[PDB]
Structure 1
Amino acid sequence: KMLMNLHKEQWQSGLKMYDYEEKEESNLAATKSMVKIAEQYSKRIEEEKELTEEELKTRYVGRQDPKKHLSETADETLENNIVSVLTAGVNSVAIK
């Protein structure tokens, strides 16, 4: 219990809101990123009608696979913003 616990300033972090310049900035960055590697994704699923799994990964990519990289980033920012609205709506009702 001694190691895991981080005082009464542990719960404190979980009701704090942040500058919205950095939040709006976080959103745009991720958004823009998924346009760019999603042109890579377009190339990939235009083709992929040809046999040999390894050959697909050299030619149209499958090493640092575009579908995979997009999906992780999309999920990450989606989870943040579910939090950002939850933590905000909590404070609005809770404190007032």
Structure 2
Amino acid sequence: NYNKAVEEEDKMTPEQLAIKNVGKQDPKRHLEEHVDVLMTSNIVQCLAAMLDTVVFK
């Protein structure tokens, strides 16, 4: 839900960056912070799932 349902509210902003074109005040950067959060969110889940391969054997 944070990796999908948050995507559409994040990926509407590039369609909001399309004006079109161009009557709306620019620039605006919506890239952060969800992108890097979901990155680290996998970094939490990948190395915690490595506990299967790390702890065991």
TM-score, normalised via structure 1 length? 0.44
Match of 1:77 among 16, 22, 38: 38
2:4 corresponds in structure 1 to: 28
Task: Give the paired residue count.
Answer: 56
Structure 1: 4+ residue segments shifted above 3 A: none
Task: List alignment gaps of at least 5 residues for structure 1.
Answer: 1-24, 48-58
1:92 corresponds in structure 2 to: 52
CA distance, structure 2, for counterparts of residue 70 and residue 94 of structure 1: 34
Residue 27 of structure 1: how far off its partner (Å): 0.8
1:59-88, Cα deviation, whole Å (9 max, x unpaired): 42348x2xx223322122122112221221
**Aligned sequence identity (%):** 23
Larger radius of gyration: 1
Structure with the higher helix share, 1 or 2 = 1
Q: In 2 relative to 1, CA 42–78 (structure 1 residues): closer, same or farther, beyond 3 Å? A: farther
Residue 30 of structure 1: how far off its partner (Å): 2.6
